[PDB]
RNA sequence: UCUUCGGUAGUAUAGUGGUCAGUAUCCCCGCCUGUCACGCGGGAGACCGGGGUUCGAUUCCCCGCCGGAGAGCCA
């Protein structure tokens, strides 16, 4: 009767060894699929700078309003602008093209905008020096807004330019420089990576205002004089590449890991069951050898 | 002729010793290198960024710190493209949810500093702004400046009675920006949600001031009338989220190592079978019958 | 045709399994080759925050013109600058170490460095107050440049300050401070990693100008008094490291091991053809 | 035959001799290992330090108040000075006084200063003192020259520096006159554990001081004291151990193997001799 | 049980590789020790003896002084005092040429060079003497430097360069006024890798007071006196020795290889002896 | 078969001669490097240092040579960095041990130079220091100074005999210092012993004097009167040992030689194995 | 396609339900009888593979691999 119980105990051990590795496999595959779904939930960041040598012509959509473009001189490399007496017009050696459109988010108002061509040569540090004057009024807070878009010649050679300002304000953000300062804007360009098209352009900038010596002007009525430059901070275009360990990585790693752990989950069980039936037969051998020595 | 026997004696010994030596020399090499790589990847968790959109922000924690400065207005201009022109100096129109707390200084435990916490803007979509106005006619420092800090939520401060520790932890964590003394500082703000190992999102603020000079010469400021201005608003509806994820999975480490061990076992067995076959083909070639 | 055609139908499965395994292997190696084409973008960013307590004092290369310093009062303990007076030179207690050399860009211009030690502690908010002065001239906009580099001691200990400062000027950028504002320049470090781990660093800074009342010295010509409050802001430094996510060892291991499941599938094919042969033998016998 | 008894002894004799020389050589090599372990050798190293290494110069005037300091960043001829004028405390006169650690009864003072820098340009501290002449003869002012001024500043519990650095030096003084000029240099010895110790050694060179300027009427004192740096080639000392980590045991095993091989070869050769002797015996039988 | 015997044979097979691992570990340890020994070269000194020292180099920059006596007391120590200030007894091989500064490049240096003493057995000493007019510098001094041999200045050319090179190698010792600075000099030779012998001078001054009461120097004029005896009749010979020789560790590696071969062979013989368990069945 | 026999024999012979040769080349090459290494390490012995420690030094001799002066004051001020100073220039209070010997010179062999031998301080831990105030009449001593010489055994000087030679040899060996005529020469003598070969080690005194000036305001200005103080101490409670070790060991070197000879013998055995492989190849050649 | 016969050291076989899987040759070592074996004395190498019964199966049974033997269309 002892052997009749032993043949049941060893069957129980057989089933235990089978189901141990039949449950480990399912637990591991479920854990791996859950982990790879988690990885699919959110990708990681992969930046690259790809420094350039000759920037494109950028777009600067000023909204001067009632002011006047006194000067838009392009200091081709002159990091120290030639001092000139404020308060009078002159030297419109600029690439301005006054083009207006209706502003969205309002649906009721017209607003003009003298989009100008920005500097290109970062190595030479090309500049653009502006000067806006306005007869003082009740506004008491003189800020002249300005937008920024990547390509200017694209605006030059695009039919139905409605997009170029009816979408810039709806996409970009509206900065503004002060009245009575010289807002030094050191722009830079940053590119993202979307799955729909190819990429996108977003601007960054570091305004560094410096005071304006009101002498030699004497604003008796209070004539404010806006002054703006638009440098190019760096020859580098930090592009954001949103790399994913999500679509191909999940599938490939899933299939490989599972089909290669099934290998052990089968081989170890086979070896263990073979050797345990071997030891069962060995116990039978030793008891029957005690019987028939 | 024992030439075949001697060639066998050379081959099985040297070839098999070489193959079970190269097996170890590759297995231990790869296991050590990949364990080191696992430790390295555990050393440097990779960051994850995205932009979860928010239609309507909560009530932020703008907390002005005016030392003996008189508030003049709180107009929460809901959507105004530019706030309407205001005559300075005159008080009134202070429709801001305001509370004053002052217990102790977190730094040096020096003294009390009263705050003027405002509920702050909510609707980013309609570009809510909370345009302030200040006044410091009686100047003795002669070195103008006004301090302000931001915290996460208003009702979180309001409901919790930990008033002193609110301005303890907020002051210790958030830096102390100071909007300029005299001209309006259009302080757009944005939120950054960084995650932690425990799932806690300890948020911090990010702002991009844009100082606009004032032409407030309608005040006769000869006596020392230095009046300030502030504008808060929410920069973009989006919110940045920061989460550092573990790039190394030990449950993939173990799978990779057991798989390469199985590869090496199969390679050794195949090599043994192949050498046995190449040895035994001459056995059927030396004798024909 | 009763048995020869069946044997041909069995043997075409041999070529079938060969071509299937070839195609699957080619597809898998194509996927892995695309992965190591993405290897170009595999440089990813991993950042950490070293909670540093005591900080290295950094050199602060100011580049004044016709200006003259007035104070360097380092408020090691004080986080607040006590009230002071315009003009009136006093307590030039900094470590001004003028090394005025020629331009590194055009090699013609004259620059006048005034390296200051800067602060050390950040838990105590160690300010480094400064002050300048300039009698008015035809200077329609007034600005006093400056610049930064990694460490003061790396300037003091290293020899040949000529190239040490000349290359640093062109390498970094120059963000100035204005004529009449307390340009409260905070500062912080980003610790990036190069291809080998040389660990170059550059400076992040958040200026915040603030107006200064000038009635106390009645400048009747345009006298300008600058003020700079260089101060370390971050109680911890950011550590940018560009780790790469893929190594060829994983590629070769996974490929050569899915090769084994391919071989096992071939084994099942070789068993199944024999099983079908046995079944057909039983059926047609 | 009798030749068998003749040769049946030197067989075991040669193995006995080999065992004897084996134990002799193992004793010789173990004694050599003991000797080479009991006499570690040193290695001298020169490093070309280019810069500061701020030392914690100390002085113990007690009654001789300071009257001058200087820092001649490049001046091998320090110019004239007024004898007896107090002030110009350009030194970082971090004055601290502490009780004796050794006698535990004397209220000792200190006038720690900041040490010379710029060894390349030979920057040299300079001093000047004064003391109303008292009953004590042989006017002497003790002074230590411990190192690490920069860490001395930030160090906590400054009593320990004074109470400890006295024991680890000999406190060489400077005289009551004639500008005891004091050069100095460093030695960097390596301890047994792995740490290192830095000690200052100095080469005074006194030069007589002309008193044709003070014209004292009592016998007052104006003893200077001058510091500098000697050649920057700081001596690094390392006490390396004789290279016997495992070579002794490996060559012990080698001599073991060769002696066993030689014993076996001796057996082979003597067996060959026995074979040829048996052949000769059969020839001559 | 034959399967057990083959499994023990497989155990010996596994043991066969732990010897390889230990050998490779010892090889790595040996290569690390070799690199360490090539990283810290050892030093040695041998005090050789010299019967007749070379006539050394003595550079002096008196400035506005004037050598009043240059007597070679061959072995006598009796001090003659004719007059503290008179010029006389210039009995030495002296030679002065002024050269511009090789360091500042502006000033000129007046190298009033004196040959010096040779016979250490007789303890030759070159008793100098110098007087200076009163000046405002408030403490007198004379920088003086030494070089290898006066003959290296006598016959050699480029005498301007031959002194200009020896500018900052030494530390510019100096004797004072109203003193008798006794300078016992010794010479140390270092032996570096490139076969050159850089000679250096090391000396131990011992100032002794002087009596000017016999000259009535109330005005403020100071005197100077120097001697330059050679201290020891020896020369320090410091040699840096490399203590690592690859041709002394290749034999170490070979011995390791032989002992591991013997160990493996003994393991094989041990399992062959273990076959006695089957040999008993054969019996 | 003649051609095959000739070619095989020449091929085997050239292989064996090539390896046999190499064997000899590496043997002579290694014995050459052995010769070079052993001769080089015999030429340049390598020296070592160590620092033992004591708390109570023995009594060292101090051979003063006062030509005309006198022991105005001798003391044993231990532990007192402020020695009790009396009125200068007044004799008495000599609480030391002396022996006014007067022996011969090695250079003149005729002068009976005095030597007021004293024993130095011993308590380094309590920094004991002697104090030897003197005075002379300097009628003509324009550069006043009295020599002093250090030997390391006062106790062994006492009980020993032939004291003329016991002072003669120490005078010859150690160089003669001198203390200033009008200063205070603080002499912090350290003790250095070198463990030489021949079963003998010798001691050497090295010291760094530090003159500190003396003020004579307490004595009336006189002609032919300059006094001077000399101080002896103990620098460190250490004793530096300079011992020379030897790098080369004949036992180790012959061990290397035996190992490489074993390796080359095994290489020749593998050459013999190649010979037997050639023999079997020739057996196959004749079988075919 | 079907039906038998056999498969063992490197060679030839002999063994078989309970074990010096043996022997001759071949492989190694001691003797040199004129010789590197012409002759002796000691030591060494194996059940075609897989599964199943049996205390144990190289033996008993089944399935695959290898030959050789026959009918032979398997076209």
From Swiss-Prot, chain D:
Predominant subcellular localization, coarse grouping: membrane
Protein name, UniProt field: Proton-activated chloride channel
Extracellular domain ranges by topology: 27-239
Record flagged with keyword ATP-binding: no
Family: Belongs to the proton-activated chloride channel family.
Membrane topology classification: Multi-pass membrane protein
Entry's Gene Ontology cellular component terms: chloride channel complex; plasma membrane
Domain of life: Eukaryota
GO MF entries: pH-gated chloride channel activity
Alphabetically ordered keywords of this record: Cell membrane, Chloride, Chloride channel, Ion channel, Ion transport, Membrane, Transmembrane, Transmembrane helix, Transport
Subcellular location: Cell membrane
Listed transmembrane segments: 6-26, 240-260
A single BP term in Gene Ontology: chloride transport
Function: Chloride channel gated by pH that facilitates the entry of chloride ions into cells upon exposure to extracellular acidic pH.
Topological domains annotated Cytoplasmic: 261-285
Reactions that this protein is recorded to catalyse: chloride(in) = chloride(out)
Statement: the UniProt record of this protein carries the keyword Membrane: yes
UniProtKB/Swiss-Prot annotation, chain E:
Membrane topology summary: Multi-pass membrane protein
Cytoplasmic topological intervals: 262-283
Transmembrane segments: 7-27, 241-261
Catalytic activity: chloride(in) = chloride(out)
Keywords recorded for this protein, A-Z: Cell membrane, Chloride, Chloride channel, Ion channel, Ion transport, Membrane, Transmembrane, Transmembrane helix, Transport
Subcellular location: Cell membrane
MF GO annotations: pH-gated chloride channel activity
Protein name: Proton-activated chloride channel
Gene Ontology biological-process annotations: chloride transport
Job description of the protein: Chloride channel gated by pH that facilitates the entry of chloride ions into cells upon exposure to extracellular acidic pH.
Record topological domains on the Extracellular side: 28-240
Source organism per UniProt: Xenopus tropicalis (Western clawed frog)
Gene Ontology CC: chloride channel complex; plasma membrane
Family in the record: Belongs to the proton-activated chloride channel family.
């Amino acid at each position: 009767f002892s052997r009749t119980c032993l043949k049941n105990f060893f069957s129980v051990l057989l089933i235990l060894v089978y189901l141990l590795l039949m449950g480990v496999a399912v637990f591991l595959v479920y854990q791996t699929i859950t982990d790879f779904r988690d990885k699919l939930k959110h990708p990681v960041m992969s930046v690259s700078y790809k420094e350039v040598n000759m920037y494109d012509a950028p777009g600067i959509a000023l909204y001067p309003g009632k002011a006047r473009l006194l000067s838009c001189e392009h200091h081709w490399y002159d990091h120290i602008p030639p001092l000139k007496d404020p308060g009078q017009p002159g030297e419109n050696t600029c690439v301005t093209q006054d083009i207006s459109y209706i502003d969205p988010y309002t649906n009721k108002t017209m607003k003009h905008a003298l989009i100008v061509q920005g500097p290109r040569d970062v190595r030479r540090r090309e500049l653009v020096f502006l000067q806006f004057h306005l007869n003082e009024t009740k506004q008491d807070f003189s800020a002249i807004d300005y937008l920024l878009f990547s390509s200017y010649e694209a605006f030059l050679k695009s039919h139905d330019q409605v997009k170029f300002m009816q979408d810039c304000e709806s996409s970009f953000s509206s900065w503004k420089f002060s009245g009575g300062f010289r807002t030094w804007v050191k722009m830079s360009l940053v590119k993202t990576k979307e799955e729909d098209g190819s990429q996108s352009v977003e601007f960054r900038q570091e305004t560094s205002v410096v005071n304006f010596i009101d002498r030699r002007e004497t604003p008796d009525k209070g004539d404010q004089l806006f002054f703006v430059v638009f440098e190019w901070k760096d020859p580098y275009i930090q592009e954001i590449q949103d790399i994913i360990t999500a679509n191909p990585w999940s599938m490939i790693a899933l299939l490989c890991s599972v089909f290669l752990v099934l290998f052990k989950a089968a081989d170890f069980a086979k070896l263990s069951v073979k050797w345990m039936i071997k030891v069962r037969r060995r116990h039978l051998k030793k008891r029957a050898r005690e019987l028939n020595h």
